[PDB]
Design a protein around this ligand. Sequence first.
Ligand SMILES: *[C@@H]1O[C@H](CO)[C@@H](O)[C@H](O)[C@H]1NC(C)=O
Length: 261
Amino acid sequence: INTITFDAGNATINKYATFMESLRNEAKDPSLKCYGIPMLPNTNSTIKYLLVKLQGASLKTITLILRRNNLYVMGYSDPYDNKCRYHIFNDIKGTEYSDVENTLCPSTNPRVAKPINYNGLYPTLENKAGVTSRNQVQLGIQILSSDIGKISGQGSFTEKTEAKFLLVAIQMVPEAARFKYIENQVKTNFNRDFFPNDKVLELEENWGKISTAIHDAKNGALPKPLELKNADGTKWIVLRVDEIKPDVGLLKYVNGTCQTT
Ligand SMILES: *[C@@H]1O[C@H](CO)[C@@H](O)[C@H](O)[C@H]1NC(C)=O
């Protein structure tokens, strides 16, 4: 399967929806699903990485590389100085590392490294972005396009600029694929900058717990109450798969059989 592209400089809600549908369709294991929700593959599947090319209104691009099995961003590349410049997180090493480097920038064309001197965990990114919480960093289509312009092809840019771009891209691409609720936040705020609400953050932080609960659910009942948060930050108690299913687009891989429909 090849590169999925999203044009943030010429986007519409329908194009963003199509993009999410393509990302989910290529990331999901061809057959795993629980309660009708597609699940990502185990660590030894057919295709290991997905490339997602984002284009800004400047026409410049940034391509993210996602580990297909869990959708984490491994790094990104940008066309720079007539070379392919690859930026990989500092905890990616060995095989994986050279696999990421070569997938972003094939050894048959000019290339150059520009390390990401930190890892991709949210607290790390928030620290580099200079915020106590990513809910202080606005998301949005125009913001994504602008961040692409600030980095792509640029010989110089700060870690703060890069970490903010990463906070935006991670949440508008893989988190939105994982959660229809997040995709929907982008679609209902399509023409404006917006701060992610408490439910967005809570879903991002509990994807594994939510995926395990749905996978382990019997006749639609979660193993035990699942405590999350409503959009306004208040406590939300979920007892059944159907109460949370509307918000979920992809399940993290959970071993073993499950009620598939
Ligand atoms: C995964 O599940 C199968 C299918 O039930 C089981 O044979 C295997 O023990 C499990 N793997 C792990 C690590 O628990």
